[PDB]
Design a protein around this nucleic acid. Structure first.
Ligand SMILES: [K+]
Ligand SMILES: [K+]
Ligand SMILES: [K+]
Ligand SMILES: [K+]
Ligand SMILES: [K+]
Ligand SMILES: [K+]
Ligand SMILES: [K+]
Ligand SMILES: [K+]
Ligand SMILES: [K+]
Ligand SMILES: [K+]
Ligand SMILES: [K+]
Ligand SMILES: [K+]
Ligand SMILES: [K+]
Ligand SMILES: [K+]
Ligand SMILES: [K+]
Ligand SMILES: [K+]
Ligand SMILES: [K+]
Ligand SMILES: [K+]
Ligand SMILES: [K+]
Ligand SMILES: [K+]
Ligand SMILES: [K+]
Ligand SMILES: [K+]
Ligand SMILES: [K+]
Ligand SMILES: [K+]
Ligand SMILES: [K+]
Ligand SMILES: [K+]
Ligand SMILES: [K+]
Ligand SMILES: [K+]
Ligand SMILES: [K+]
Ligand SMILES: [Mg+2]
Ligand SMILES: [Mg+2]
Ligand SMILES: [Mg+2]
Ligand SMILES: [Mg+2]
Ligand SMILES: [Mg+2]
Ligand SMILES: [Mg+2]
Ligand SMILES: [Mg+2]
Ligand SMILES: [Mg+2]
Ligand SMILES: [Mg+2]
Ligand SMILES: [Mg+2]
Ligand SMILES: [Mg+2]
Ligand SMILES: [Mg+2]
Ligand SMILES: [Mg+2]
Ligand SMILES: [Mg+2]
Ligand SMILES: [Mg+2]
Ligand SMILES: [Mg+2]
Ligand SMILES: [Mg+2]
Ligand SMILES: [Mg+2]
Ligand SMILES: [Mg+2]
Ligand SMILES: [Mg+2]
Ligand SMILES: [Mg+2]
Ligand SMILES: [Mg+2]
Ligand SMILES: [Mg+2]
Ligand SMILES: [Mg+2]
Ligand SMILES: [Mg+2]
Ligand SMILES: [Mg+2]
Ligand SMILES: [Mg+2]
Ligand SMILES: [Mg+2]
Ligand SMILES: [Mg+2]
Ligand SMILES: [Mg+2]
Ligand SMILES: [Mg+2]
Ligand SMILES: [Mg+2]
Ligand SMILES: [Mg+2]
Ligand SMILES: [Mg+2]
Ligand SMILES: [Mg+2]
Lengths: 91, 59, 101
RNA sequence: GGAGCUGUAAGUAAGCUAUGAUCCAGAGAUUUCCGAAUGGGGGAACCCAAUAUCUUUUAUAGGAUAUUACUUUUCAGUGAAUACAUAGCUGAUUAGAGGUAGACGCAGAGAACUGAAACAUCUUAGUACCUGCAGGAAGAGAAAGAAAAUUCGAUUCCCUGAGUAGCGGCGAGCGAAACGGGAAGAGCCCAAACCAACAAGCUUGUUGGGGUUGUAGGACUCCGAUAUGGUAGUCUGUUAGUAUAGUUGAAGGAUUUGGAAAAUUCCGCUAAAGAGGGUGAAAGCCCCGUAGACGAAAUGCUGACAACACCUAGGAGGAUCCUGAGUACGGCGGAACACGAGAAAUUCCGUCGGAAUCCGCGGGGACCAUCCCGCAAGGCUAAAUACUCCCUAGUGACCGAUAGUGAACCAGUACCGUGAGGGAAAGGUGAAAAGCACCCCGGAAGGGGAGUGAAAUAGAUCCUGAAACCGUGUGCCUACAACAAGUCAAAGCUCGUUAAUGAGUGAUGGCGUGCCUUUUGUAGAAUGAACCGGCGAGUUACGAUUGCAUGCGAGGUUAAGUC
RNA sequence: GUAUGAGUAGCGAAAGACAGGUGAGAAUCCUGUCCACCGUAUGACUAAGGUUUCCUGGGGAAGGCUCGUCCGCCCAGGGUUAGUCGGGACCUAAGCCGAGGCCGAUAGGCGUAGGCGAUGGACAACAGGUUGAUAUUCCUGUACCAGUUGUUUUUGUUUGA
RNA sequence: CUUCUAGUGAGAAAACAACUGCCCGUACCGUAAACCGACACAGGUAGUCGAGGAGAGUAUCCUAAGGUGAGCGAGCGAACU
């Protein structure tokens, strides 16, 4: 896949903001992307240096509106920690 | 638009596709935040990329 | 639809029979149309639409297209519409006069 | 095609559109992963690789692309036991796998309940199921035939023959065919003899020619013609038509009721259009349409024309040669023929034996003779015929929400089950949301006003709104009575109708053991019903027979089929 | 669909009391105190299974055999971080699949090579801290395992490490 | 994994510094109200830890760490079970 397609969007939540304070940023990524690919994509996109990438799979969550019930799409969350002496990602 | 694309050259087309892909990336980030206003721009950019790829394949 | 947005039409059936107005909006899928000052309804709105009174608003509701007839602009009378190609352009014509549109 | 559009699906939000959007049809691009699934693995939609190129990093790790299953065909190279070889192995090449449409076809394999009033032969039935192979159809098909009117001339299917001839524990049942009438029609190729070439080992294989049959044909030998016709061929064009979007398409206004007119009433108008649908109630003339006219860039389909292609010779002779072999046929054992071994032909399977070949061979229901008809053991062949998952356009003395598909509604869903599998319920506000602003009680729910509306006792559990069931009000009666609960007689009280010698209630008195089923006999202590509503049982097809009716009458009548 | 039985059976092993708070409303929700119960468990971990039931903020229609301001319920957001843990890129058992192959009316049955297959073998990290919800995964400290690049140091370059 | 040679071989080893290390699971319940039993069901559910006194003991009684007061109650204190 294209490096630009690897990273989908940032994740903004209380936990992710606390992580930012430690200079690690959470991104939703393509479910087929391995953390090595995620590292390459982040570097190319933001010019920062990545120290480590911790990836996890978010299961599809059951939801229902009215008579209809289904599941939210599965997601893949990656927490990317930048090195020291590195630019921050600005969102 | 399709007329402009057909005028372009192959290398120009590829570079334009890369620029459009980067623009789409930024749009995704802005939408994830509250920083995007013209939401229809996302679909516009996607269609532009599709047109370039279609023209490329038809060369 | 044989009627178009912005046309002057005459209401031929309904409580507002013989009224005339301009077509404010057209709904081809429903085959309906809105005519200004025609078929006005009182609607009990909550103040949730940037109206800090809610109030009872007056608005024209659509009526079926077949209950109106286009006003012959040159003569001012309602007429049926034929289709004649003029100067290579397909246009509407007043069957009563031959006037265009 | 020409003004809106961003589905359902409202609501925002942001946009597109006369530079022609949305939308409609033709063609094309993309088309993740699983799935025959095929690089390997696997608990489907996941995991792990090899090779080569490319890509990220200083570099490893990482990413992308292409190829990589198995078997079959052909080719090439490699290459054992083993010398040559062959086998194996490698590569290239070739075409298969799987799914369907719960239909139709052919074939292999193949039941039982049931019927016979038991049951084994027989029947159900070569049916259901399973499996293989298919094609748009299949199968059959060009006589070793049907016949014996003297003749017919491939096959298939329909009518008829006929419930006949027959088969059958001669039971139950099963049950033809030919002739005749129609639908449709079409006939052709090899093997062999012999010839030429090729190659090896005078024949013997390959190639091409040759030749194709029963009034016997062919080879072969003589002659004469190098034409005449045909085809069931071709992504060959050219052309027409057609399918897949479309354009056009006549004619009404008033009056009364109404919330609304298409209804009513008065005068008109149109009709190659008075099919149909919609529109505030029932419209020929308001809308979509219809009759009719017109229309295709693109892609299929059909038909023609042409082209290319492929078939297409007459006569006379027989001296000799050829005309389908482990075949036909026979014994044994099964099976198919309506025919169940029977007197049993004919067809087929397994096993064994096993011919003739033109003076020949097969058949005409054992068998033989005569006569007649035909020429097997090789192949192909359109049409009439069967079926409809689908697509288009319609139809219905077909259903109308317990009906009609299980499914009118997000249904093969929910739900049930380990699984195969089983499998629901559930439609309707109003013309238009105009879906009740505001106020009041209440935490809300829910109400009462106020509004919308023709109507709100149409308020979303929304059309109508039955019965069971539940409750409020009360005109009459009821606390000394033994009651299948009624009916007959009747005072009193209350009320006044489809105005009738009226209605409700009813003290009191006479008589009086429900309904159904099944029984000799049931109030029955025999059976069934908790109540209410809906649904729920002699039908249709083809034959037989009788009555009645009609037409014709010693006559009556057509069936298939054609329009 | 609705009755009758009938406002009847039942409300599913056991201790709760009171004060205060919340709130329209409290035996039932929160807080506190005392009391009581389990304690080879009714405690603490884990595998399977379940599959969001976890956390935070709301709600009280329905579900909860009462009540409910509360819940494993409803509504809206949020939460699962690994070179070292368990599994895969390691190994094999039973069993299963099975190129060719054998057998067989069809379908298929069997099976060699080769594979798959843990419940077993092999295999490098621990302590503390941190959140409302994760931790041998994050953070702090201190390690180890496999490998790449580079600097340096030694030693071998075909009688060859 | 350890050895052996066969083969392969121009590079090897050490220290140091910097650097690389993929996919899947990780929430929560788990002698249970979250699993199997149609139920928030006196049943069933593999493995580990499982303290003190008396005690052989994981028995038994009462307790620690820790967990819990069982999702209808208030009266009355008849028959009968
Ligand atoms: K597979
Ligand atoms: K079918
Ligand atoms: K039988
Ligand atoms: K019987
Ligand atoms: K055929
Ligand atoms: K018959
Ligand atoms: K019998
Ligand atoms: K010939
Ligand atoms: K109308
Ligand atoms: K009409
Ligand atoms: K055409
Ligand atoms: K026979
Ligand atoms: K015969
Ligand atoms: K014959
Ligand atoms: K009504
Ligand atoms: K009453
Ligand atoms: K009486
Ligand atoms: K009885
Ligand atoms: K009941
Ligand atoms: K009751
Ligand atoms: K709460
Ligand atoms: K691991
Ligand atoms: K294990
Ligand atoms: K965890
Ligand atoms: K002790
Ligand atoms: K103890
Ligand atoms: K309780
Ligand atoms: K008592
Ligand atoms: K007692
Ligand atoms: Mg992980
Ligand atoms: Mg266009
Ligand atoms: Mg595969
Ligand atoms: Mg019988
Ligand atoms: Mg086909
Ligand atoms: Mg018209
Ligand atoms: Mg009229
Ligand atoms: Mg027979
Ligand atoms: Mg025989
Ligand atoms: Mg014979
Ligand atoms: Mg003859
Ligand atoms: Mg045919
Ligand atoms: Mg139904
Ligand atoms: Mg109904
Ligand atoms: Mg049904
Ligand atoms: Mg009413
Ligand atoms: Mg109603
Ligand atoms: Mg007395
Ligand atoms: Mg009395
Ligand atoms: Mg009796
Ligand atoms: Mg009964
Ligand atoms: Mg009782
Ligand atoms: Mg209890
Ligand atoms: Mg104990
Ligand atoms: Mg909770
Ligand atoms: Mg909560
Ligand atoms: Mg309750
Ligand atoms: Mg392991
Ligand atoms: Mg096997
Ligand atoms: Mg095989
Ligand atoms: Mg380990
Ligand atoms: Mg936790
Ligand atoms: Mg945990
Ligand atoms: Mg329990
Ligand atoms: Mg105790």
């Amino acid at each position: 896949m294209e490096l630009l397609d690897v990273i989908k969007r940032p994740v903004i939540t209380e936990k992710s903001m606390l992580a930012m304070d430690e200079k690690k940023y959470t991104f939703e990524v393509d479910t087929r992307a391995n953390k090595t690919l995620v590292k390459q994509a982040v570097e190319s996109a933001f010019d920062v240096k990545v120290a480590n990438v911790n990836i996890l799979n978010v299961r599809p969550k059951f939801k229902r509106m009215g008579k209809y019930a289904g599941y939210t799409k599965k997601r893949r969350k990656a927490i990317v920690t930048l090195t020291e002496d590195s630019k921050e990602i600005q969102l | 638009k399709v007329k402009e694309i057909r005028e372009l050259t192959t290398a120009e087309m590829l570079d334009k596709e890369k620029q459009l892909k980067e623009e789409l990336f930024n749009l995704r980030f802005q939408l994830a935040t509250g920083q995007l206003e013209n939401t229809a721009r996302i679909k516009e950019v996607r269609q532009s990329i599709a047109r370039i790829k279609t023209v490329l394949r038809e060369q | 639809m044989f009627v178009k947005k912005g046309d002057k039409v005459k209401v031929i059936t309904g409580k507002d029979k013989n009224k005339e107005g301009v077509v404010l909006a057209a709904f081809p899928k429903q085959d309906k149309v809105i005519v200004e000052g025609v078929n006005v309804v009182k609607k009990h709105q909550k103040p949730n639409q940037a109206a800090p009174q809610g109030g009872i608003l007056e608005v024209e509701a659509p009526i079926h297209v077949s209950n109106v007839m286009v006003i012959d602009p040159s003569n001012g009378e309602a007429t049926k519409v034929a289709f004649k190609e003029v100067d290579g352009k397909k246009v509407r014509v007043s069957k009563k006069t031959g006037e265009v549109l």
